[PDB]
Amino acid sequence: TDEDVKKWREERKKMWLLKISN
């Protein structure tokens, strides 16, 4: 479902976003 995808989507999203500052 979208919820399953939403799960990984934001997961990987934050990883690179936080990596911008690291």
UniProtKB/Swiss-Prot annotation:
Cell compartments where the protein resides: Nucleus
Cystines in this chain: none
Cited function: Involved in a late nucleoplasmic step of 60S ribosomal subunit assembly.
Other information: Present with 259 molecules/cell in log phase SD medium.
Protein name per UniProt: Ribosome assembly 1 protein
Protein source organism: Saccharomyces cerevisiae (strain ATCC 204508 / S288c)
